[PDB]
Amino acid sequence: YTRVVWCAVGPEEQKKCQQWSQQSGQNVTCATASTTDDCIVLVLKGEADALNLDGGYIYTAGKCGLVPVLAENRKSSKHSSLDCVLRPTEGYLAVAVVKKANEGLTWNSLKDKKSCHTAVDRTAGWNIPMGLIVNQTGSCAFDEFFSQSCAPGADPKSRLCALCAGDDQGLDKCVPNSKEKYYGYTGAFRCLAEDVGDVAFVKNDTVWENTNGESTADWAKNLNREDFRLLCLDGTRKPVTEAQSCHLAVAPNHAVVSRSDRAAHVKQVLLHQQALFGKNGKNCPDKFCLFKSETKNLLFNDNTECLAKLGGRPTYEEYLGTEYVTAIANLKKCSTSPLLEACAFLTR
Amino acid sequence: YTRVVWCAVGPEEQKKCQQWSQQSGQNVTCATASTTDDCIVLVLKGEADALNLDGGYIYTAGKCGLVPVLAENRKSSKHSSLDCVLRPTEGYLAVAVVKKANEGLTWNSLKDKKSCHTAVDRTAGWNIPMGLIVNQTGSCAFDEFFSQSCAPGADPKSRLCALCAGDDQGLDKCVPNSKEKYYGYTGAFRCLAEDVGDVAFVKNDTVWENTNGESTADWAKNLNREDFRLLCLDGTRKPVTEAQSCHLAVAPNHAVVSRSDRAAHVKQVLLHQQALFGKNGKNCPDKFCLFKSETKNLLFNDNTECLAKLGGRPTYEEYLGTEYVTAIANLKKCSTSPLLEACAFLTR
Numbered sequence: 193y194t195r196v197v198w199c200a201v202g203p204e205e206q207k208k209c210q211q212w213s214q215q216s217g218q219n220v221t222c223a224t225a226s227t228t229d230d231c232i233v234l235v236l237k238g239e240a241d242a243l244n245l246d247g248g249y250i251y252t253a254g255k256c257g258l259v260p261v262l263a264e265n266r267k268s269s270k271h272s273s274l275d276c277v278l279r280p281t282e283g284y285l286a287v288a289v290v291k292k293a294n295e296g297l298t299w300n301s302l303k304d305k306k307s308c309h310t311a312v313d314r315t316a317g318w319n320i321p322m323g324l325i326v327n328q329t330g331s332c333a334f335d336e337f338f339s340q341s342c343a344p345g346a347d348p349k350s351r352l353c354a355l356c357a358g359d360d361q362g363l364d365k366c367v368p369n370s371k372e373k374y375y376g377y378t379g380a381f382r383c384l385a386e387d388v389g390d391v392a393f394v395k396n397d398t399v400w401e402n403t404n405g406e407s408t409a410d411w412a413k414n415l416n417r418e419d420f421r422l423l424c425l426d427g428t429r430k431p432v433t434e435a436q437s438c439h440l441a442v443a444p445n446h447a448v449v450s451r452s453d454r455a456a457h458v459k460q461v462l463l464h465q466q467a468l469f470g471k472n473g474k475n476c477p478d479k480f481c482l483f484k485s486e487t488k489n490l491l492f493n494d495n496t497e498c499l500a501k502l503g504g505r506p507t508y509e510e511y512l513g514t515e516y517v518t519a520i521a522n523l524k525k526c527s528t529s530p531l532l533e534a535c536a537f538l539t540r
Numbered sequence: 541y542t543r544v545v546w547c548a549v550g551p552e553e554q555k556k557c558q559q560w561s562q563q564s565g566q567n568v569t570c571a572t573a574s575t576t577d578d579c580i581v582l583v584l585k586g587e588a589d590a591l592n593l594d595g596g597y598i599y600t601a602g603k604c605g606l607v608p609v610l611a612e613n614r615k616s617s618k619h620s621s622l623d624c625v626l627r628p629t630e631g632y633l634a635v636a637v638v639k640k641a642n643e644g645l646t647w648n649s650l651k652d653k654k655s656c657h658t659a660v661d662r663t664a665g666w667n668i669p670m671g672l673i674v675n676q677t678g679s680c681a682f683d684e685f686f687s688q689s690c691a692p693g694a695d696p697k698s699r700l701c702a703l704c705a706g707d708d709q710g711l712d713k714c715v716p717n718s719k720e721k722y723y724g725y726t727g728a729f730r731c732l733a734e735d736v737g738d739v740a741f742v743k744n745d746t747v748w749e750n751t752n753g754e755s756t757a758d759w760a761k762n763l764n765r766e767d768f769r770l771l772c773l774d775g776t777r778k779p780v781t782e783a784q785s786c787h788l789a790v791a792p793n794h795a796v797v798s799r800s801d802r803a804a805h806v807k808q809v810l811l812h813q814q815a816l817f818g819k820n821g822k823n824c825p826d827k828f829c830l831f832k833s834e835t836k837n838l839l840f841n842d843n844t845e846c847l848a849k850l851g852g853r854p855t856y857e858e859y860l861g862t863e864y865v866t867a868i869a870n871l872k873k874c875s876t877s878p879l880l881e882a883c884a885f886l887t888r
């Protein structure tokens with residue numbers, strides 16, 4: 193079996209996948225599922241081979257025995273002659289975002305506000321913010337800390353999914369895939385920009401990438417950077433330019449995960465695949481571009497220069513980092529998770 | 541060893557072979573095996589010398605180091621003046637064939653349909669259709685694409701062998717030799733003519749050759765040309781008369797293969813052998829006709845005028861054509877093969 197079966201989450205990621213298969217000549221093929229946890233189960237079960245996960249989902253995959261393969265790398269500030277595949281990975285900035293018009297909304301005034309999230313169990317939209325909120329309150333009532341939220345993945349009949357809009361017919365409310373209007377980085381931002389929520393937990397890069405006409409989709413083009421403000425742990429409301437000291441935490445990059453037995457092969461294929469269809473690649477933009485999806489961060493983030501290597505075969509722990517592992521572990525004492533609990537025997 | 545040891549597949553091909561031996565005065569003799577792969581292994585091992593293979597089987601033979609010797613060549617409409625052994629080869633038309641009666645079955649609704657095939661790994665019955673289906677779906681789960689199939693050679697306990705009937709006691713279900721009821725071109729057709737399947741992947745010529753009493757065997761004689769029809773890649777359902785732009789792909793002719801050292805010998809013996817017992821032959825029909833097989837396409841196709849030479853020194857690649865070689869290679873990224881793996885190994 194020399195093909196690598198990519199798991200796509202939802203029809204958008206699935207149609208991109210379909211193309212990737214065709215252009216790579218079935219070097220890559222596609223399994224599909226509604227949610228990322230379903231895909232993690234597909235990879236567990238041998239019906240798929242690999243997928244690109246947010247660090248939060250990498251915690252779950254690693255609890256189920258999967259390992260990381262290749263990290264994402266995005267344009268750096270240091271500017272290095274070292275090649276993208278060899279350049280050290282940077283992290284990204286998890287930040288809270290508000291409309292500047294809503295004054296008097298600081299860190300310490302978030303209770304009973306409407307919040308927007310990428311999805312449940314992701315790093316910027318959930319793990320870091322909710323972990324911090326639980327730490328301060330001394331309470332596991334993250335479910336009742338906000339009046340309403342949109343957090344795809346949560347209990348669909350809960351208040352954490354009250355704000356999620358579904359697709360366009362309004363169906364599949366709060367499924368954690370891009371079919372949902374407010375899924376993901378982009379979706380949490382949109383959720384804020386149409387003021388369905390008061391704060392959005394995203395990354396630094398989302399704010400710039402969707403403001404000042406960088407996205408010429410409906411909601412986004414008209415958006416404006418100065419109308420938005422980064423809440424800090426201190427209690428301030430700084431502008432987006434001040435992200436380097438107004439960030440909630442530093443988040444490990446979305447990385448590819450696979451089973452151990454299939455790791456080295458998947459890496460191989462992917463290293464070559466990005467040569468063919470990556471940023472500066474032979475068939476990019478002729479036949480297919482792997483890291484470009486028309487602003488929907490499909491399969492990978494759109495701002496991915498390339499997939500960088502890692503040192504050795506790292507575990508999910510080494511990759512994510514002892515301290516982020518602990519922050520996650522602690523947030524998860526507040527909440528049992530089916531996939532996590534079914535797998536919990538693998539690490540005892 | 542001036543004898544050419546022909547490999548026969550099944551007792552049916554074996555008993556025709558036997559006669560061919562006797563009349564040719566042991567200029568040719570017979571080895572036997574259950575399947576075509578087994579015969580290719582006999583040629584590898586020096587235990588046989590040559591046999592006539594479908595283009596798909598020629599790819600496998602070529603991965604194991606065998607070379608083509610003489611193509612089959614069929615009654616043409618054009619050129620027709622250069623003698624048969626010197627006439628350029630034309631290819632053949634791989635087509636999908638359905639009962640006309642079954643409306644609402646085009647190309648794009650073949651999922652969950654019942655399929656009939658010549659055998660696994662052949663050009664018209666397997667490689668071209670499945671290759672396209674895998675390309676369309678972006679998925680290597682071709683085994684689960686059709687509800688049931690008959691594809692001799694597949695895992696006999698699988699669903700791709702569910703429909704195959706065996707011989708007459710029903711034994712040897714789904715072995716890819718003519719003793720199984722739905723093996724080969726003819727066998728795929730019949731699988732349709734008795735509606736055990738909904739589509740059959742065969743060549744143009746099979747359709748005419750079994751309809752309108754062109755065959756006076758049981759199932760075939762009563763057939764009508766217009767009760768069967770050809771699905772197109774566009775999605776149409778045009779007549780068999782319309783084969784020329786409702787063809788799935790162009791198929792390289794069934795060719796004889798041998799080991800590389802024995803090629804030039806086998807050629808001469810065969811060119812002389814067809815002079816003796818061929819279409820236009822001194823001992824045909826008197827004592828033996830090499831290209832007539834009791835309507836069972838034994839050893840060679842029945843519509844074979846003769847064996848034509850090949851241009852230059854061809855590899856299995858050159859003969860089949862750079863593009864169909866790739867169509868095969870990709871479909872085989874979805875499936876490991878024992879003989880191919882042993883040959884990817886031992887010859888290197």
Ligand SMILES: *[C@@H]1O[C@H](CO)[C@@H](O[C@@H]2O[C@H](CO)[C@@H](O[C@@H]3O[C@H](CO)[C@@H](O)[C@H](O)[C@@H]3O)[C@H](O)[C@H]2NC(C)=O)[C@H](O)[C@H]1NC(C)=O
Pocket residue numbers: 215216217219464465468
């Ligand atoms: C699909 O995946 C295959 C498998 O990796 C890719 O084919 C491989 O790519 C190149 C193109 O010929 C070959 O690599 C080179 O081989 C030669 C030795 O002859 C040498 O320059 C280097 O050692 C280098 O590795 C390799 O032979 C080839 N593999 C096969 C089996 O042909 C292919 O590029 C991928 N295509 C797409 C569209 O994804």
Ligand SMILES: *[C@@H]1O[C@H](CO)[C@@H](O[C@@H]2O[C@H](CO)[C@@H](O[C@@H]3O[C@H](CO)[C@@H](O)[C@H](O)[C@@H]3O)[C@H](O)[C@H]2NC(C)=O)[C@H](O)[C@H]1NC(C)=O
Pocket residue numbers: 267268269271285396397400401435436
């Ligand atoms: C927060 O996210 C934004 C958006 O990704 C980051 O800004 C981006 O930073 C890179 C590197 O600093 C910029 O590239 C630089 O731009 C100049 C063009 O003047 C170019 O010559 C250099 O080669 C260099 O790559 C990039 O333009 C910029 N993106 C946008 C949309 O402005 C920012 O660095 C992040 N902030 C923190 C604190 O990490």
Ligand SMILES: *[C@@H]1O[C@H](CO)[C@@H](O[C@@H]2O[C@H](CO)[C@@H](O[C@@H]3O[C@H](CO)[C@@H](O)[C@H](O)[C@@H]3O)[C@H](O)[C@H]2NC(C)=O)[C@H](O)[C@H]1NC(C)=O
Pocket residue numbers: 563564565567816
């Ligand atoms: C089996 O194969 C051998 C070939 O190796 C056949 O032997 C050949 O038999 C013919 C006579 O039938 C000989 O032909 C000669 O041709 C010239 C014309 O250029 C003529 O002048 C001679 O008088 C003679 O007719 C030929 O020499 C001979 N070849 C060998 C190598 O001995 C044999 O007939 C084949 N038998 C069957 C049943 O296939």
Ligand SMILES: *[C@@H]1O[C@H](CO)[C@@H](O[C@@H]2O[C@H](CO)[C@@H](O[C@@H]3O[C@H](CO)[C@@H](O)[C@H](O)[C@@H]3O)[C@H](O)[C@H]2NC(C)=O)[C@H](O)[C@H]1NC(C)=O
Pocket residue numbers: 615616617633744745746748749783784
């Ligand atoms: C699809 O397959 C059918 C059957 O294999 C092809 O029809 C056959 O075509 C040959 C050559 O065109 C015909 O031979 C002709 O016979 C007549 C005598 O009646 C003669 O006038 C011509 O000189 C030529 O020799 C043959 O009769 C015909 N067979 C049948 C049963 O109709 C057809 O050409 C194939 N079409 C495509 C597009 O591949």
Ligand SMILES: *[C@@H]1O[C@H](CO)[C@@H](O)[C@H](O)[C@H]1NC(C)=O
Pocket residue numbers: 214215217675676
């Ligand atoms: C089949 O794959 C080819 C490349 O091998 C691609 O160009 C084509 O688009 C694929 N088929 C379809 C229906 O897209």
Ligand SMILES: *[C@@H]1O[C@H](CO)[C@@H](O)[C@H](O)[C@H]1NC(C)=O
Pocket residue numbers: 324327328
């Ligand atoms: C809160 O602070 C940090 C989380 O940022 C954590 O290390 C610490 O254990 C927590 N303690 C309490 C009492 O919440």
Ligand SMILES: [Fe+3]
Pocket residue numbers: 246247314315316446
């Ligand atoms: Fe993330």
Ligand SMILES: [Fe+3]
Pocket residue numbers: 594595662663664791794
């Ligand atoms: Fe064939």
